[PDB]
Design a protein around this ligand. Structure first.
Ligand SMILES: N#Cc1ccc(Cc2cc(O)n3ncc(C(=O)Nc4ccc(F)cc4)c3n2)cc1
Length: 277
């Protein structure tokens, strides 16, 4: 029942101002897991479990999205310690984050970018349907299950319950934040999400993000540094519309001409991932 008897703890995987994550194995079935520790003192957002339990908002959100759909890394279990919470998360093997993947490969071929972006969209839709807003969509928060060619969202440490009214707080990544936040400190969940997806898509096909400074975000002029098709440029520019109401809905994105004929995840892996080149 204690954490230490159910799981064998291994070396560090990663960390940050969000938490520290270790490799692990569930003793009962040898299932590979990831073990994330969060300091109670570093937690700003608290939530309530349906049985009235004070936990980190991150746990609340994870639980809501953690039914079997495989586009998010699921929370298998959690533990409370005197000064921390411990999250047991699934761990695909082999696995690589999208940030490292792009860095390794440079800009992605559009067929691959299409597959990846489509899966991210499906994963984000899943989250919204579960009443959860991620608020930090970016390459570092996306894992690739290399064998299956399936992408998985991680790190709901900056997330919130999804609502239809204005958010006046943001603790996600600034260069992925929309102009309305930069200018007015106000945004709506879905349209800000679409903005971040526009940045993500650009990063996929160009190998780097489009904006570095606040003035660039506010200007909203997108320059392409890599060869990118006219349909992909159009979708990107659309997602990066300065006015939130001018941005496409998720329906409109997925009905966009650039998005048609997406590969299945296993196809994607066979063509693009199972290779030395
Ligand atoms: N690659 C990589 C990879 C990606 C991120 C990290 C650090 C990190 C930081 C963080 O604040 N959070 N918050 C949640 C996760 C998480 O779920 N990470 C994770 C899960 C399964 C897995 F197989 C690998 C990482 C997480 N990871 C480590 C390894």
């Amino acid at each position: 029942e204690p954490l230490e008897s159910q799981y064998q703890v291994g070396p560090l995987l990663g960390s940050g101002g969000f938490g520290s994550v270790y490799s692990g194995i569930r003793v009962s079935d040898n299932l590979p897991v990831a073990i994330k520790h969060v300091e109670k003192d570093r937690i700003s957002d608290w939530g309530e479990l349906p049985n009235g339990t004070r936990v980190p908002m991150e746990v609340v959100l994870l639980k809501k999205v953690s039914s079997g759909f495989s586009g998010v890394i699921r929370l298998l279990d959690w533990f409370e310690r005197p000064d921390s919470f411990v999250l047991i998360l699934e761990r695909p093997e082999p696995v690589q984050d999208l940030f490292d993947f792009i860095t390794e490969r440079g800009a992605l071929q559009e067929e691959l970018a299409r597959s990846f972006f489509w899966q991210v969209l499906e994963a984000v839709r899943h989250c919204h349907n579960c009443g959860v807003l991620h608020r930090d969509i970016k390459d570092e928060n996306i894992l690739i299950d290399l064998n299956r060619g399936e992408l998985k969202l991680i790190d709901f440490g900056s997330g919130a319950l999804l609502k239809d009214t204005v958010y006046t707080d943001f603790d996600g990544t600034r260069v992925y934040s929309p102009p309305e936040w930069i200018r007015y400190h106000r945004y709506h969940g879905r349209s800000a999400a679409v903005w971040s997806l526009g940045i993500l898509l650009y990063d996929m096909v160009c190998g780097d993000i489009p904006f570095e400074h606040d003035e660039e975000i506010i200007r909203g002029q997108v320059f392409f540094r890599q060869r990118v098709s006219s349909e992909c440029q159009h979708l990107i520019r659309w997602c990066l519309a300065l006015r939130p109401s001018d941005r496409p809905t998720f329906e409109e994105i997925q009905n966009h001409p650039w998005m048609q004929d997406v590969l299945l995840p296993q196809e994607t892996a066979e063509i693009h991932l199972h290779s030395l080149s």
